[PDB]
Design an enzyme around this catalytic site. Structure first.
Site, PDB file in Angstrom:
ATOM      1  N   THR A  24      -6.060  -2.914  14.510  1.00  0.00           N
ATOM      2  CA  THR A  24      -6.826  -2.273  15.571  1.00  0.00           C
ATOM      3  C   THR A  24      -8.020  -3.138  15.963  1.00  0.00           C
ATOM      4  OG1 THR A  24      -6.227   0.025  15.074  1.00  0.00           O
ATOM      5  CG2 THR A  24      -8.374  -0.356  16.100  1.00  0.00           C
ATOM      6  N   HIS A 177       3.556   4.936  11.381  1.00  0.00           N
ATOM      7  CA  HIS A 177       2.331   4.799  10.602  1.00  0.00           C
ATOM      8  C   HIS A 177       2.178   5.963   9.625  1.00  0.00           C
ATOM      9  CE1 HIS A 177      -2.183   3.437  10.683  1.00  0.00           C
ATOM     10  NE2 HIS A 177      -1.707   3.569   9.458  1.00  0.00           N
ATOM     11  N   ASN A 180      -2.840   4.676   4.999  1.00  0.00           N
ATOM     12  CA  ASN A 180      -4.299   4.675   5.187  1.00  0.00           C
ATOM     13  C   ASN A 180      -4.935   6.029   5.481  1.00  0.00           C
ATOM     14  OD1 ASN A 180      -3.873   1.961   4.783  1.00  0.00           O
ATOM     15  ND2 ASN A 180      -4.176   1.398   6.933  1.00  0.00           N
ATOM     16  N   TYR A 182      -3.899   8.887   7.061  1.00  0.00           N
ATOM     17  CA  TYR A 182      -3.769   9.561   8.345  1.00  0.00           C
ATOM     18  C   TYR A 182      -2.820  10.750   8.256  1.00  0.00           C
ATOM     19  CZ  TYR A 182      -6.552   5.780  10.235  1.00  0.00           C
ATOM     20  OH  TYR A 182      -7.576   4.897  10.495  1.00  0.00           O
ATOM     21  N   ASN A 237     -10.215   6.663   4.192  1.00  0.00           N
ATOM     22  CA  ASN A 237     -10.469   7.926   4.880  1.00  0.00           C
ATOM     23  C   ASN A 237     -10.447   9.166   3.986  1.00  0.00           C
ATOM     24  OD1 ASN A 237     -10.887   6.877   7.604  1.00  0.00           O
ATOM     25  ND2 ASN A 237      -8.692   6.418   7.595  1.00  0.00           N
TER      26      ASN A 237
HETATM   27  C1  LIG Z   1      -9.809  -5.228  11.824  1.00  0.00           C
HETATM   28  C2  LIG Z   1      -8.702  -4.540  11.082  1.00  0.00           C
HETATM   29  C3  LIG Z   1      -7.896  -3.624  11.747  1.00  0.00           C
HETATM   30  C4  LIG Z   1      -6.857  -2.989  11.067  1.00  0.00           C
HETATM   31  N1  LIG Z   1      -6.049  -2.082  11.725  1.00  0.00           N
HETATM   32  C5  LIG Z   1      -4.940  -1.531  11.120  1.00  0.00           C
HETATM   33  C6  LIG Z   1      -4.041  -0.737  11.829  1.00  0.00           C
HETATM   34  O1  LIG Z   1      -4.215  -0.495  13.027  1.00  0.00           O
HETATM   35  N2  LIG Z   1      -2.945  -0.201  11.185  1.00  0.00           N
HETATM   36  C7  LIG Z   1      -2.725  -0.462   9.849  1.00  0.00           C
HETATM   37  O2  LIG Z   1      -1.742   0.027   9.289  1.00  0.00           O
HETATM   38  N3  LIG Z   1      -3.604  -1.265   9.146  1.00  0.00           N
HETATM   39  C8  LIG Z   1      -4.711  -1.799   9.779  1.00  0.00           C
HETATM   40  N4  LIG Z   1      -5.555  -2.642   9.080  1.00  0.00           N
HETATM   41  C9  LIG Z   1      -5.056  -3.130   7.756  1.00  0.00           C
HETATM   42  C10 LIG Z   1      -4.297  -4.443   7.889  1.00  0.00           C
HETATM   43  O3  LIG Z   1      -3.120  -4.246   8.637  1.00  0.00           O
HETATM   44  C11 LIG Z   1      -3.916  -4.989   6.522  1.00  0.00           C
HETATM   45  O4  LIG Z   1      -3.427  -3.948   5.712  1.00  0.00           O
HETATM   46  C12 LIG Z   1      -5.067  -5.679   5.788  1.00  0.00           C
HETATM   47  O5  LIG Z   1      -6.245  -4.905   5.724  1.00  0.00           O
HETATM   48  C13 LIG Z   1      -5.363  -7.027   6.438  1.00  0.00           C
HETATM   49  O6  LIG Z   1      -5.888  -7.863   5.438  1.00  0.00           O
HETATM   50  P1  LIG Z   1      -4.885  -8.853   4.679  1.00  0.00           P
HETATM   51  O7  LIG Z   1      -4.514 -10.009   5.572  1.00  0.00           O
HETATM   52  O8  LIG Z   1      -5.598  -9.371   3.459  1.00  0.00           O
HETATM   53  O9  LIG Z   1      -3.642  -8.096   4.284  1.00  0.00           O
HETATM   54  C14 LIG Z   1      -6.615  -3.272   9.723  1.00  0.00           C
HETATM   55  C15 LIG Z   1      -7.436  -4.189   9.058  1.00  0.00           C
HETATM   56  C16 LIG Z   1      -8.471  -4.829   9.738  1.00  0.00           C
HETATM   57  C17 LIG Z   1      -9.344  -5.820   9.022  1.00  0.00           C
HETATM   58  C1  LIG Z   2      -6.469   1.488  12.316  1.00  0.00           C
HETATM   59  C2  LIG Z   2      -7.538   1.448  11.267  1.00  0.00           C
HETATM   60  C3  LIG Z   2      -7.204   1.479   9.976  1.00  0.00           C
HETATM   61  N1  LIG Z   2      -6.021   1.490   9.526  1.00  0.00           N
HETATM   62  O1  LIG Z   2      -4.992   2.336   9.964  1.00  0.00           O
HETATM   63  O2  LIG Z   2      -5.758   0.722   8.621  1.00  0.00           O
HETATM   64  C4  LIG Z   2      -9.002   1.391  11.614  1.00  0.00           C
HETATM   65  C5  LIG Z   2      -9.456   1.668  12.891  1.00  0.00           C
HETATM   66  C6  LIG Z   2     -10.817   1.603  13.177  1.00  0.00           C
HETATM   67  C7  LIG Z   2     -11.744   1.252  12.202  1.00  0.00           C
HETATM   68  C8  LIG Z   2     -11.291   0.964  10.925  1.00  0.00           C
HETATM   69  C9  LIG Z   2      -9.928   1.028  10.639  1.00  0.00           C
END
Ligand SMILES: Cc1cc2nc3c(=O)[nH]c(=O)nc-3n(C[C@H](O)[C@H](O)[C@H](O)COP(=O)(O)O)c2cc1C
Ligand SMILES: C/C(=C\[N+](=O)[O-])c1ccccc1
Length: 369
Positions: A24, A177, A180, A182, A237
């Site tokens: 995201t 999804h 995390n 949700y 969360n």
């Molecule tokens: C900026 C940011 C946005 C993320 N958004 C999502 C997301 O939209 N959906 C999701 O399943 N995980 C999300 N995550 C988790 C990443 O997909 C992943 O699990 C991990 O945190 C990325 O770090 P890594 O390269 O060490 O695995 C997000 C992580 C970051 C840092």
């Molecule tokens: C999309 C997500 C997390 N996630 O699903 O891993 C996320 C969105 C906004 C701020 C922080 C995290």
């Protein structure tokens, strides 16, 4: 097997085994994908599979500001430009269909409603809330209301539309999804689910919603175009689970019968220690994978969290995992696939530019010479 050699995930063929994790970025005002988003995804098209940032199936599923959705015609058109761009470069892309559940705010909800959840328990979490233009942001998540049986049927129907919308937007498939903390996680874990009906109590009852979502999505677009993301031990969360092992081992046994395309697994706390345990006993990932394989699961096994070049290579060659997904590394390096093959040095990501803003820290990361 090699990290750079092609793979097969259901009906989806991958050029290599390097996957872009869903990330995201909060850069789609009006819940609609735009041209800057297209450039950003096209830069990274060399990935074997691109998993888009979380995309809500409805406004009710929204939990943050400036997040692209699948509930608008304009949003589908915006997504069609992106999937066209990615496909032209020879890449593959899947949509991560999303529902936040209790992790939301009234301003984001339709009619200014309460966020929805299995049980009416407020979370100690934060949200991005846009302020006119703006900006403001940062607020506590709102008080949720408990879902009725009719409500769940309507959310299942919204999942069906989202899956249909994704194919109409030219996606190769979807990623459900379920990670995390949700909506789906809220049903799965004990701390969030205090229901007294068929969706609460036993492991079989708690897993019911996840399987109903999977079945609804697979019926619409096909099992071979359907994948799912899980995170057994994440504390994200305000979520807690006493005994993750029997719960999650049961979930994958059911999934192994489903003929799914892939299973995306977050190992350890998301953006945290890989060895993280919520309960008394540590999670066994080898046991977790075997419960899927033994049930007949042929889906591509995709691992994530804290992987480097050396670790990713060993995991695939050893066959512990089928593929590896990088999150922060794909943010900093658009041409990550080429760098890893060359053993070239990697760009470093900039934390302050992860969420919100414009081109800086988004499309302005330099590729290789
Ligand atoms: C900026 C940011 C946005 C993320 N958004 C999502 C997301 O939209 N959906 C999701 O399943 N995980 C999300 N995550 C988790 C990443 O997909 C992943 O699990 C991990 O945190 C990325 O770090 P890594 O390269 O060490 O695995 C997000 C992580 C970051 C840092
Ligand atoms: C999309 C997500 C997390 N996630 O699903 O891993 C996320 C969105 C906004 C701020 C922080 C995290």
């Amino acid at each position: 097997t090699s990290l750079f050699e092609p793979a097969q995930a259901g009906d989806i063929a991958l050029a290599n085994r390097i996957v872009m994790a869903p990330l995201t970025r909060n850069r789609s005002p009006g819940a609609i994908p735009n041209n800057l988003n297209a450039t950003y995804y096209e830069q990274r098209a060399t990935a074997g599979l691109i998993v888009t940032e979380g995309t809500p199936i409805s406004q009710q599923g929204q939990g943050y500001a400036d997040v692209p959705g699948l509930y608008k015609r304009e949003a589908i058109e915006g997504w069609k430009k992106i999937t066209d761009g990615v496909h032209s470069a020879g890449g593959k892309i899947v949509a991560q269909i999303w529902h936040v559940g209790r992790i939301s705010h009234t301003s984001l909800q339709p009619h200014g409603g309460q966020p929805v959840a299995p049980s009416a328990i407020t979370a100690k979490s934060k949200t991005y809330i846009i302020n006119d233009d703006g900006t403001g942001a940062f607020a506590e998540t709102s008080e949720p209301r408990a879902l009725t049986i009719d409500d769940i049927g309507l959310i299942l129907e919204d999942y069906r539309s989202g899956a249909r919308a994704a194919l109409e937007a030219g996606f190769d498939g979807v990623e459900i999804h379920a990670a995390n903390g949700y909506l789906i996680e809220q049903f799965l874990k004990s701390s969030t689910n205090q229901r007294t009906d068929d969706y609460g109590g036993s492991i079989e009852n708690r897993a019911r919603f996840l399987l109903e979502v999977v079945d609804a999505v697979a019926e619409e677009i096909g099992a071979g175009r359907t994948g799912i993301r899980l995170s057994p031990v994440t504390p994200a969360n305000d979520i807690f689970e006493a005994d993750p092992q029997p719960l999650y081992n049961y979930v994958v046994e059911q999934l192994g019968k489903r003929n799914l395309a892939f299973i995306h697994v977050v190992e350890g706390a998301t953006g945290g220690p890989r060895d993280f345990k919520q309960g008394d006993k540590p999670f066994d990932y080898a046991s977790f994978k075997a419960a899927y394989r033994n049930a007949g699961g042929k889906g591509l096994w995709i691992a994530n969290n804290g992987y480097d070049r050396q670790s990713a290579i060993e995991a695939v060659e050893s066959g512990k995992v089928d593929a590896v997904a990088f999150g922060k590394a794909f943010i900093a390096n658009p041409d990550l696939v080429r760098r890893l093959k060359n053993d070239a040095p990697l760009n470093a990501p900039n934390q302050p530019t992860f969420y919100g803003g414009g081109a800086e820290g988004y499309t302005d990361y330099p590729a290789l010479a």
